[PDB]
Amino acid sequence: KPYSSPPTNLRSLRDRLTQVAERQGVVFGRLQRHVAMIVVAQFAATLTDDTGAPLLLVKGGSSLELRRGIPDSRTSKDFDTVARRDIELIHEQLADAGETGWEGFTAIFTAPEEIDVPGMPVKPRRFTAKLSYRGRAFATVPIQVSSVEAGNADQFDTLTSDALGLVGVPAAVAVPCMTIPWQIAQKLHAVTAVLEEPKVNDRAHDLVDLQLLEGLLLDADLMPTRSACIAIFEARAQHPWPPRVATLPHWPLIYAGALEGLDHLELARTVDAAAQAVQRFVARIDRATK
Ligand SMILES: [Mg+2]
Ligand SMILES: [Mg+2]
Ligand SMILES: [Mg+2]
Ligand SMILES: [Mg+2]
Ligand SMILES: [Mg+2]
Ligand SMILES: [Mg+2]
Ligand SMILES: [Mg+2]
Ligand SMILES: [Mg+2]
Ligand SMILES: [Mg+2]
Ligand SMILES: [Mg+2]
Ligand SMILES: [Mg+2]
Ligand SMILES: [Mg+2]
Ligand SMILES: [Mg+2]
């Protein structure tokens, strides 16, 4: 019943995925995106400095999915990361890793392009991983890489997933991730940011993720989070800490979209209530002292 040998080919891989997905009550494409992200994460985890410490830390929706599992996280499409080396090093090192492969998977990477960002001195980079399994195209993963901000690569959490185990690929999964205080600081900054009026802030989904991150801090001391929030807001030199969690007129349905699949969790059910919850979190962070 549990596969004793790895999938012999793509078709066998897809067949085992659909079985696992049906078995777990998960959408096939969701499980497939998760497995592909994991494979890319394993490539990224081979990138170390000359002391063996990670060069790339995972963040964003991939991190939340690793922290909470598929049933308890938003569907997201990006593999978002933070690097401690230049993009040119990162892209070249990833391409090598993807050529060497991992457990039958290989990847080729499109070229990095810069993206518009006002608070980062170094512009983020974005490209794509074309994944294959035993020679045959398998999946596409959008990748984003941003440079360090303040202390947000000083430490990392190491998370895992058994999804590849469940389809007969047993090699341990271990993914270095940006820690929760920095995920909170960056999402709080993004969800409260005011953009230039050609552009509009659509990040209502960050209100969902911020509730999930507050839940994951449990009763932790908030002081590291407060320090991280201060550091990110001062570093970006835009709106000041503590921000106001405002809602824009088009956010009600975006927030509703972001709740898809999470009916079983205790989340704010309306964007107003979500803004109120995250504002209370902001105040709670700001109160921290010891
Ligand atoms: Mg096949
Ligand atoms: Mg299914
Ligand atoms: Mg390092
Ligand atoms: Mg994800
Ligand atoms: Mg992903
Ligand atoms: Mg710092
Ligand atoms: Mg193992
Ligand atoms: Mg705003
Ligand atoms: Mg609504
Ligand atoms: Mg969403
Ligand atoms: Mg729901
Ligand atoms: Mg609820
Ligand atoms: Mg409130």
Coordinates of C-alpha atoms and ligand atoms in Angstrom, one line a residue:
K1 CA 0.0 0.0 0.0
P2 CA 3.0 2.3 0.6
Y3 CA 5.1 2.3 -2.5
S4 CA 8.3 0.3 -1.8
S5 CA 10.1 1.7 -4.9
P6 CA 10.2 5.2 -6.4
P7 CA 8.0 6.0 -9.4
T8 CA 9.7 4.6 -12.6
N9 CA 8.5 7.5 -14.7
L10 CA 6.3 10.6 -14.9
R11 CA 3.1 8.7 -15.5
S12 CA 3.7 6.6 -12.5
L13 CA 4.5 9.7 -10.5
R14 CA 1.3 11.4 -11.5
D15 CA -0.7 8.2 -10.8
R16 CA 0.7 8.0 -7.3
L17 CA 0.0 11.7 -6.7
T18 CA -3.7 11.3 -7.7
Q19 CA -4.0 8.3 -5.3
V20 CA -2.4 10.3 -2.5
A21 CA -4.5 13.4 -3.2
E22 CA -7.7 11.4 -3.3
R23 CA -6.5 9.5 -0.2
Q24 CA -5.9 12.8 1.7
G25 CA -8.9 14.8 0.4
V26 CA -6.8 17.2 -1.4
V27 CA -7.0 18.7 -4.9
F28 CA -4.5 16.9 -7.2
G29 CA -3.1 20.1 -8.7
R30 CA -2.5 21.4 -5.2
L31 CA -0.5 18.3 -4.2
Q32 CA 1.4 18.5 -7.5
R33 CA 2.3 22.1 -6.9
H34 CA 3.4 21.3 -3.4
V35 CA 5.6 18.4 -4.5
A36 CA 7.2 20.6 -7.2
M37 CA 7.9 23.3 -4.6
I38 CA 9.5 20.7 -2.4
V39 CA 11.8 19.5 -5.2
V40 CA 12.8 23.1 -5.9
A41 CA 13.3 23.6 -2.1
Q42 CA 15.6 20.5 -2.1
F43 CA 17.7 22.1 -4.9
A44 CA 17.8 25.4 -2.9
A45 CA 18.8 23.6 0.2
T46 CA 22.0 22.3 -1.5
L47 CA 23.2 26.0 -1.8
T48 CA 25.4 26.7 1.2
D49 CA 28.2 29.1 2.0
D50 CA 31.7 27.8 2.8
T51 CA 30.6 27.1 6.4
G52 CA 27.7 25.0 5.2
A53 CA 25.0 27.5 6.2
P54 CA 22.0 28.1 3.8
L55 CA 22.3 30.6 1.0
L56 CA 18.5 30.7 0.4
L57 CA 15.7 30.9 2.9
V58 CA 12.1 30.2 1.9
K59 CA 9.3 32.6 2.7
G60 CA 5.8 33.6 1.6
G61 CA 3.1 31.1 0.8
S62 CA 5.4 28.2 0.4
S63 CA 6.7 28.7 3.9
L64 CA 3.2 28.9 5.4
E65 CA 2.2 25.7 3.5
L66 CA 5.2 24.0 5.0
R67 CA 4.4 25.3 8.5
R68 CA 0.7 24.5 8.5
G69 CA 0.3 21.8 5.8
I70 CA -1.8 22.0 2.7
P71 CA -5.2 21.7 4.5
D72 CA -4.5 24.7 6.7
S73 CA -2.8 27.1 4.3
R74 CA -3.8 29.3 1.4
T75 CA -3.2 27.9 -2.1
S76 CA -0.3 29.9 -3.5
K77 CA 1.8 29.6 -6.6
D78 CA 5.2 31.3 -5.8
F79 CA 8.4 29.8 -4.5
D80 CA 9.5 33.1 -2.7
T81 CA 13.0 33.2 -1.2
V82 CA 15.6 35.4 0.4
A83 CA 19.3 35.1 -0.5
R84 CA 22.5 35.9 1.2
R85 CA 24.4 36.1 -2.1
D86 CA 23.9 38.0 -5.4
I87 CA 21.2 36.8 -7.8
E88 CA 23.9 36.0 -10.4
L89 CA 25.5 33.5 -7.9
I90 CA 22.0 32.2 -6.9
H91 CA 20.8 31.7 -10.4
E92 CA 24.0 30.0 -11.5
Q93 CA 24.1 27.8 -8.4
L94 CA 20.4 26.8 -8.8
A95 CA 21.0 25.9 -12.4
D96 CA 23.8 23.6 -11.4
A97 CA 21.8 22.0 -8.7
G98 CA 18.9 21.4 -11.1
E99 CA 21.2 19.8 -13.7
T100 CA 22.7 17.5 -11.1
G101 CA 19.2 16.7 -10.1
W102 CA 17.6 15.2 -6.9
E103 CA 15.9 11.8 -6.6
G104 CA 15.1 11.7 -10.3
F105 CA 14.0 15.3 -10.7
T106 CA 15.9 17.9 -12.8
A107 CA 15.2 21.5 -13.5
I108 CA 16.2 24.2 -16.0
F109 CA 15.8 27.8 -15.0
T110 CA 14.7 30.8 -17.1
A111 CA 16.7 34.0 -17.0
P112 CA 16.3 36.4 -14.0
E113 CA 14.5 39.7 -14.6
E114 CA 14.3 42.6 -12.2
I115 CA 11.0 43.8 -10.8
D116 CA 9.9 47.2 -9.6
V117 CA 10.4 47.7 -5.9
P118 CA 10.7 51.0 -4.0
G119 CA 11.9 49.9 -0.6
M120 CA 14.6 47.4 -1.6
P121 CA 17.9 49.0 -2.6
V122 CA 18.5 45.8 -4.5
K123 CA 15.6 44.9 -6.8
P124 CA 14.1 41.4 -6.3
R125 CA 14.6 38.9 -9.1
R126 CA 12.1 36.5 -10.7
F127 CA 12.4 33.5 -13.0
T128 CA 11.0 30.1 -13.5
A129 CA 12.0 26.4 -12.9
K130 CA 11.0 23.9 -15.5
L131 CA 10.9 20.6 -13.7
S132 CA 11.3 17.1 -15.2
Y133 CA 11.2 13.7 -13.7
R134 CA 13.3 11.0 -15.3
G135 CA 13.5 13.0 -18.5
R136 CA 9.9 14.1 -19.0
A137 CA 8.5 17.6 -18.2
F138 CA 6.6 17.6 -14.9
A139 CA 5.8 21.1 -13.6
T140 CA 6.6 24.8 -13.7
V141 CA 7.5 26.7 -10.6
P142 CA 7.6 30.5 -10.5
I143 CA 10.5 31.6 -8.3
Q144 CA 11.3 34.9 -6.7
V145 CA 14.5 35.9 -4.9
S146 CA 15.0 39.0 -2.8
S147 CA 18.0 40.3 -1.0
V148 CA 18.5 40.3 2.7
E149 CA 16.8 43.0 4.8
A150 CA 18.2 43.8 8.3
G151 CA 18.4 40.5 10.3
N152 CA 15.9 38.5 8.2
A153 CA 18.5 36.0 7.2
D154 CA 20.3 35.9 10.5
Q155 CA 18.5 32.7 11.5
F156 CA 16.2 30.1 10.0
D157 CA 13.6 27.4 10.8
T158 CA 14.0 24.0 9.2
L159 CA 10.7 22.5 8.0
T160 CA 9.8 19.3 6.3
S161 CA 7.1 17.5 4.4
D162 CA 6.3 13.8 3.8
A163 CA 4.6 14.3 0.5
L164 CA 7.4 12.8 -1.5
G165 CA 7.6 10.0 1.0
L166 CA 4.0 9.1 0.4
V167 CA 4.7 8.5 -3.3
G168 CA 7.8 6.3 -2.7
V169 CA 10.6 8.9 -2.7
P170 CA 11.9 8.6 0.8
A171 CA 14.9 11.0 0.9
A172 CA 14.6 13.3 3.8
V173 CA 13.1 16.8 3.2
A174 CA 14.5 19.7 5.2
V175 CA 13.8 23.3 4.1
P176 CA 15.4 26.4 5.7
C177 CA 12.8 29.1 6.1
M178 CA 12.7 32.7 7.2
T179 CA 11.6 32.8 10.8
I180 CA 8.1 33.9 11.8
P181 CA 9.0 37.4 13.3
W182 CA 10.4 38.4 9.9
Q183 CA 7.5 36.9 7.9
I184 CA 5.2 39.0 10.1
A185 CA 7.2 42.2 9.7
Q186 CA 7.3 41.9 5.9
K187 CA 3.6 41.0 5.4
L188 CA 2.6 43.7 7.8
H189 CA 4.6 46.2 5.8
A190 CA 3.2 44.9 2.5
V191 CA -0.5 44.8 3.5
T192 CA -0.4 48.4 4.9
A193 CA 1.7 49.9 2.1
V194 CA 0.3 52.7 -0.1
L195 CA 1.3 52.2 -3.8
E196 CA 1.7 54.8 -6.6
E197 CA -1.8 55.4 -8.0
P198 CA -1.2 53.7 -11.3
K199 CA -0.8 50.7 -9.1
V200 CA -3.1 49.7 -6.2
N201 CA -2.5 47.4 -3.2
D202 CA -4.4 44.1 -3.7
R203 CA -2.7 42.2 -0.9
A204 CA -5.9 41.4 1.1
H205 CA -4.6 37.8 1.2
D206 CA -1.9 38.9 3.6
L207 CA -4.7 39.5 6.2
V208 CA -5.3 35.7 6.1
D209 CA -1.6 34.8 6.3
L210 CA -1.1 37.3 9.2
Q211 CA -3.8 35.6 11.2
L212 CA -2.2 32.2 10.5
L213 CA 1.2 33.5 11.6
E214 CA -0.2 35.0 14.8
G215 CA -1.7 31.6 15.5
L216 CA 1.7 30.0 15.0
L217 CA 3.4 32.2 17.5
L218 CA 1.1 30.7 20.2
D219 CA 2.1 32.4 23.5
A220 CA 5.6 33.3 22.3
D221 CA 7.2 36.5 23.4
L222 CA 6.5 39.2 20.8
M223 CA 9.7 41.1 21.3
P224 CA 11.6 39.5 18.4
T225 CA 8.6 40.2 16.2
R226 CA 8.5 43.8 17.4
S227 CA 12.2 44.3 16.7
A228 CA 11.8 42.7 13.3
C229 CA 8.8 45.0 12.5
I230 CA 10.8 48.1 13.6
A231 CA 13.8 47.0 11.5
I232 CA 11.8 46.3 8.4
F233 CA 9.7 49.5 8.6
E234 CA 12.8 51.7 9.3
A235 CA 14.9 49.9 6.6
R236 CA 12.2 50.5 3.9
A237 CA 11.8 54.1 4.9
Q238 CA 8.2 54.4 3.8
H239 CA 5.2 54.5 6.1
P240 CA 6.2 54.3 9.8
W241 CA 5.7 51.7 12.4
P242 CA 3.1 51.1 13.9
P243 CA 0.9 51.1 10.7
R244 CA -2.9 51.4 10.3
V245 CA -4.5 48.3 8.8
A246 CA -6.8 49.9 6.3
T247 CA -9.1 48.1 3.9
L248 CA -9.5 49.2 0.3
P249 CA -12.9 49.2 -1.5
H250 CA -12.1 46.2 -3.7
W251 CA -10.7 44.0 -0.9
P252 CA -13.9 42.3 0.3
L253 CA -14.0 39.8 -2.6
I254 CA -10.2 39.4 -2.7
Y255 CA -10.3 38.5 1.0
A256 CA -13.2 36.1 0.3
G257 CA -11.0 34.5 -2.4
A258 CA -8.2 34.1 0.1
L259 CA -10.4 32.2 2.4
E260 CA -11.2 29.5 -0.1
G261 CA -10.5 26.1 1.4
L262 CA -10.1 27.3 5.0
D263 CA -13.7 27.1 6.2
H264 CA -12.5 24.7 9.0
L265 CA -10.2 27.3 10.6
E266 CA -11.1 30.0 13.1
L267 CA -10.4 33.0 10.8
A268 CA -12.2 36.3 10.4
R269 CA -14.9 35.7 7.9
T270 CA -15.0 39.3 6.5
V271 CA -12.3 41.7 5.5
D272 CA -13.4 44.2 8.1
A273 CA -13.0 41.6 10.9
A274 CA -9.7 40.5 9.4
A275 CA -8.4 44.1 9.4
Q276 CA -9.6 44.5 13.0
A277 CA -7.8 41.2 14.0
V278 CA -4.5 42.3 12.4
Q279 CA -4.8 45.7 13.9
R280 CA -5.1 44.2 17.4
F281 CA -2.0 42.0 16.5
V282 CA -0.1 45.2 15.5
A283 CA -1.0 46.8 18.8
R284 CA 0.0 43.7 20.7
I285 CA 3.3 43.6 18.9
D286 CA 3.9 47.3 19.6
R287 CA 3.2 46.7 23.4
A288 CA 5.9 44.1 23.8
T289 CA 8.7 45.0 26.2
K290 CA 10.0 41.8 27.9
Ligands
MG1 MG 5.9 7.8 -17.8
MG2 MG -8.0 14.4 -5.3
MG3 MG 24.7 32.1 4.6
MG4 MG 3.0 27.0 -1.7
MG5 MG 4.5 26.5 -3.7
MG6 MG 17.7 43.3 12.7
MG7 MG 14.0 9.7 5.3
MG8 MG -3.2 50.1 1.8
MG9 MG -17.9 39.2 0.6
MG10 MG -5.3 33.8 -1.8
MG11 MG -13.4 29.5 4.1
MG12 MG -14.1 31.6 11.8
MG13 MG -9.0 46.4 16.0

